[PDB]
Amino acid sequence: DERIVLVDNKCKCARITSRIIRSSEDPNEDIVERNIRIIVPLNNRENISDPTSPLRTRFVYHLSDLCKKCDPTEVELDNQIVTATQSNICTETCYTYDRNKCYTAVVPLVYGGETKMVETALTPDACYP
Amino acid sequence: IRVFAIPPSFASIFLTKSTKLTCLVTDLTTYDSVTISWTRQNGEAVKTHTNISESHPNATFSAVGEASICEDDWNSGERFTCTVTHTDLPSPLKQTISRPKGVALHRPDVYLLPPAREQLNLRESATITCLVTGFSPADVFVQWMQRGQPLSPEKYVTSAPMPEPQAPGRYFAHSILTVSEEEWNTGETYTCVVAHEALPNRVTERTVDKSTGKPTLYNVSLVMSDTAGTCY
Amino acid sequence: LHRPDVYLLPPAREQLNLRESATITCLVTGFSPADVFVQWMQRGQPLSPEKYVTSAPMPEPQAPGRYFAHSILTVSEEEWNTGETYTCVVAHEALPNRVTERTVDKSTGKPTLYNVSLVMSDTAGTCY
Amino acid sequence: ALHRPDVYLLPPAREQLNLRESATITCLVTGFSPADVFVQWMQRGQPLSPEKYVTSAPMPEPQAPGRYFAHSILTVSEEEWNTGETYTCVVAHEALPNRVTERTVDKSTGKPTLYNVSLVMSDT
Amino acid sequence: ALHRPDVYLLPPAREQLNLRESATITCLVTGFSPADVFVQWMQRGQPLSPEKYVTSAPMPEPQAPGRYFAHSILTVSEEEWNTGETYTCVVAHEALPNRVTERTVDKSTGKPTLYNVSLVMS
Amino acid sequence: SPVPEGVRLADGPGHCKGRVEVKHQNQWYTVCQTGWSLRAAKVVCRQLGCGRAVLTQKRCNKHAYGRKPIWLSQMSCSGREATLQDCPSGPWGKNTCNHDEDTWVECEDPFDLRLVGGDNLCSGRLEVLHKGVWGSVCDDNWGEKEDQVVCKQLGCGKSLSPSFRDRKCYGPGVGRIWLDNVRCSGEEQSLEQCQHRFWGFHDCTHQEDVAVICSG
Ligand SMILES: *[C@@H]1O[C@H](CO)[C@@H](O[C@@H]2O[C@H](CO)[C@@H](O)[C@H](O)[C@H]2NC(C)=O)[C@H](O)[C@H]1NC(C)=O
Ligand SMILES: [Ca+2]
Ligand SMILES: [Ca+2]
């Protein structure tokens, strides 16, 4: 209740919260706190959509490209309504999987000579077809 | 007698949605025998709107005259001129105006500077700064907002574009807003809306706040696991 | 209808020391009825029907109505030490997409050590 | 002829334990002839009922002619397994010199040795 | 009524430095009367050329009548700002006691931070 | 002074765009009051029910045949007030229409929704009309609360919680994914009254669509 969520990334599992604590009583001596929580996977591979990819042992977390806003907002100017660009900075790699997303693959299946490629489910359960 | 004719900038076109031409006349003696006239390049007349203001301490009168022509004619490059006739002037004055052509378009950058730490110790007021820079041509419109409602114009002052010493053909400008110290310590939010012709969507917006600034502490936490291969 | 579960167990540590061969097991349990189809592959290449074996399903003593079976594949010690990948594919009616696959190698599954590197730059960037 | 069976015990999978439901162990016996094998299980020196583990009949090995193999599967509650108990697999064959061989697996089987971790904080 | 002005310096924007072109230093001076002010830029005790900063002009403050204010901005190279060079904004006003007041900032100008890093192994 | 019987917005594409035409007693004329802010345009749009005012401007008169006379009173309206009847007007007098310009107003297309692919309606894929185009809604966040809001608007009764077993009978879509991350808390009256991301921005695929089955 006393914390405000800024970003809730799922691919990098990054979550940032900010909070002001009323330390002492002088209004000019209150500290501003920034919390970062990162969960890293140790079993996932380089490309989450290809099981043959090698393992990944290097993780990079840029905070300038995480707390960024990229959706035009509406602004009232007393004579019209316009769309405004939040940031000008606006291929990112997905470290972990997303529950709200489904991951599938193509695999050759041989039986009596004939080969039937069928869609698989890399994720354990995720969504249903 | 001095006559100033200012052209309508794109900032006025964006909001008013109407292109009007004004010919300011200063140091005027007899306002009962004056004529503010607007003509085209061939000699055709344009309907004028002359309004006489109040008196002045220096016993002078100011003439304000609006002429309206929609943007299709003006942006095509046609030239206009202003004529002021006076019974004391043997010859009417001629002042021409037109919009320049042939300038490149560079996208401007928006910078918001939080108030200085040494200013809020006086418990008097604060000062937020909205900086727009590196843009061509020299046309810019800046307006401040709070909670979606426009602020009173006096609370802020905006300057004219000035050249950039380190880069030819580029300009910059500033905007300053003054607010109370307790309001800033409470945690209110502010907004700087900037409009320029070279923007992809013609309007840009930034927001500053006390909480989302420079933090004293950085409580970083990292958790390692070999089974959490997915995040909800 | 019950969705089956699949797990792979890597070769034993004291089997590789003899430097003769390695054995990988694919355990599928918790399913009904008792008709399953397990096929092994090596980095997208279907393997021969002769290198792997499979067993008929048998009842589970703990929970009645759910069965289990496993498939055993053998590989050369040098081939497994190189770092090749292997996949276990099972076909059953209970699955949503009706086929699932899982992948194991040397680096994943009872490893020796864990090497991690982390970089955190632009920690004082603009957030707004 | 006769040959010496080898005993391999495999711990439960990490992914199955992450579900916090159950754990399974495997006692693989291979490279032996003829088909006469008798395998039990033990827990802290006392035997368990034969309703909690299942054994399979010998099956010819396609790779090496004249060799057989068999497997036994036992179910263990994840919480018990996480307490730290010990389980034993005993294989009885006529070719072994003493007719009896034993293997033991614990929770700590497979624990890694090094956790090399490095962190960089560049405030650029 | 002569009044002592107040000088405020603004450290450069961090995102401008992140993008690595230059930096913006602002010298905000208000609260002086009458309209007579002269600001200069010096580095390491050596005044800089007049072609290094742009000087604004006096203009009344709408909130408090009778007060004027202006500012000056000097652009610096990113490497020069990173190397640790110092800058200052000396101001001159008749109402000042010694007619000279200075405010100085640097890269190190700020409040000390902390890092409570936690590395959970399981 | 005359009381406006209604507005018609003639000489424009459709009836949500054109010139402001106040209905004067008997014969009606065009109006060009000064200070025409968006607040009066909002009331004008609400008169017709088109939707939200988006733009208002005065256009130069270049042989536009403005035969319609002009009014003689102002219509200062707060925008949040009711129909043009309930907003103050000046006591007749002269006109503020110095420059001869027509007043323009641009309302928006009204909202609509339907179910496509289900038998006897009340079932199938969700399509929402906006900008004159139908499109699909993403299922990234589709709680049970977001299901009942759609059902009552079309009068299909309370949803019977059909799960996803019967949601495969409608298939995917081909239209643009207009809405995403929809979160409806209360009943409200319409889906647009909820909190969404934006119109045209999504991170979904036509495979992942929303299927709603009400009681019928
Ligand atoms: C990661 O894996 C995906 C899936 O194989 C790669 O993208 C696929 O590329 C093939 C052709 O090579 C296409 O047939 C698929 O449609 C692609 N997938 C999707 C979802 O479009 C992707 O290139 C791989 N990434 C890397 C870096 O190798
Ligand atoms: Ca989804
Ligand atoms: Ca979404």
Residue numbers in the entry:
A (entry chain J): 2 to 91, 97 to 135
B (entry chain L): 345 to 576
C (entry chain A): 449 to 576
D (entry chain B): 448 to 571
E (entry chain K): 448 to 569
F (entry chain N): 132 to 347
Publication passage describing the model:
Apoptosis inhibitor of macrophage (AIM/CD5L) is a soluble protein belonging to the scavenger receptor cysteine-rich (SRCR) superfamily that contributes to prevention of a wide range of diseases associated with infection, inflammation, and cancer. AIM forms complexes with IgM pentamers which helps maintain high-levels of circulating AIM in serum for subsequent activation on release from the complex. Here we apply cryogenic electron microscopy imaging (cryo-EM) to show how interfaces on both of AIM’s C-terminal SRCR domains interact with the Fcμ constant region and J chain components of the IgM core. The human Fcμ/J/AIM complex shows the binding of tandem AIM SRCR domains to IgM leading to sequestration and stabilisation of AIM.
AIM recognises IgM at both Fcμ and J chain. The total buried surface area (BSA) between AIM and IgM is 994 Å2, with 652 Å2 between AIM and J chain and 342 Å2 between AIM and subunit Fcμ5. The unpaired cysteine residue C191 in SRCR2AIM forms a disulfide bond with C414 in Cμ3-5B, which aligns with the fact that AIM does not dissociate from IgM during SDS–polyacrylamide gel electrophoresis in non-reducing conditions. This disulfide bond is crucial, as the C191S mutant completely abolished the binding between IgM and AIM, as previously shown. In addition, K173 and R183 in SRCR2 form two salt bridges with β-hairpin 2 of J chain at E77 and E75. SRCR3AIM sits between β-hairpin 2 and β-hairpin 3 of J chain and interacts with both loops. F329 and F332 on SRCR3 pack against P96 in β-hairpin 2 of J chain through a van der Waals contact, plus a salt bridge between D72 and R328.
